[PDB]
Amino acid sequence: SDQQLDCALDLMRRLPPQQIEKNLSDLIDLVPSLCEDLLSSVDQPLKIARDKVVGKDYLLCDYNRDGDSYRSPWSNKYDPPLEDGAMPSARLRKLEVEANNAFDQYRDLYFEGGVSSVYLWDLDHGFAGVILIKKAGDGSKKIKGCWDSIHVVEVQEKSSGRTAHYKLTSTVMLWLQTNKTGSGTMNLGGSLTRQMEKDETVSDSSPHIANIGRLVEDMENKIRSTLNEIYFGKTKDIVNGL
């Protein structure tokens, strides 16, 4: 059943990414016992929702889900409401608020639009989090694009509290397509995933969000370049060679 999981993940690597959601629901229908592991390890295009009590948008993924409800980072409330849904510890909720605000600014500075959300969760000897960013380009032109960032970070604090080990797994999904359908339609879409690890000083001048901010920024700057090379260089040279 880990060999089942690997086969399912191998499947998602080959099936057209233009159909991720439908293929994910089909795959879970096919192997129901894998539901939980599939939902956690299969990245999907990010969905937008409105938090009506605060009047801000937030992003949906498995990391803010419980039952069939989603938690907003602004109001810290599930929607539809939930009696008992997973919540961050009070200390961690505080950091989650600062992190949302911080990455809101990061998004403005790098994306000049789109939407971002940050969700944190407690671990035995640290904490983890996801940084989500969704930016659509001009959808009015002959060609339109969209960008989804999914940055999952795992943080292990050392006992001294002076260093921590940071583990980043980042997915960027990049979708470009012709507004025409079908004849003359062209769709270039999918995702790349990368990993970074780093030990870092943790102090009043280098707190968690700053250390995480830098890793996410480094990662995204690198992946942007890599996307450019893969999408517009590599797939194009393959086409040229057909």
């Binding site: 939902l39 039952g67 849904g85 969760w121 983890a128």
Partner: protein, 33 residues
């Protein structure tokens, strides 16, 4: 047939998202979608 078919890829694909930290839910989904 039916039997596992050959591959020229040489190596398994690695699945980086497998190694991501897990968040525990209080309840599992009704539907995936």
């Amino acid at each position: 047939f039916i039997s596992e078919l050959p591959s020229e890829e040489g190596k398994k694909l690695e699945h980086f998202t497998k190694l991501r930290p897990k968040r525990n839910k209080k309840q599992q989904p009704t539907q995936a979608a």
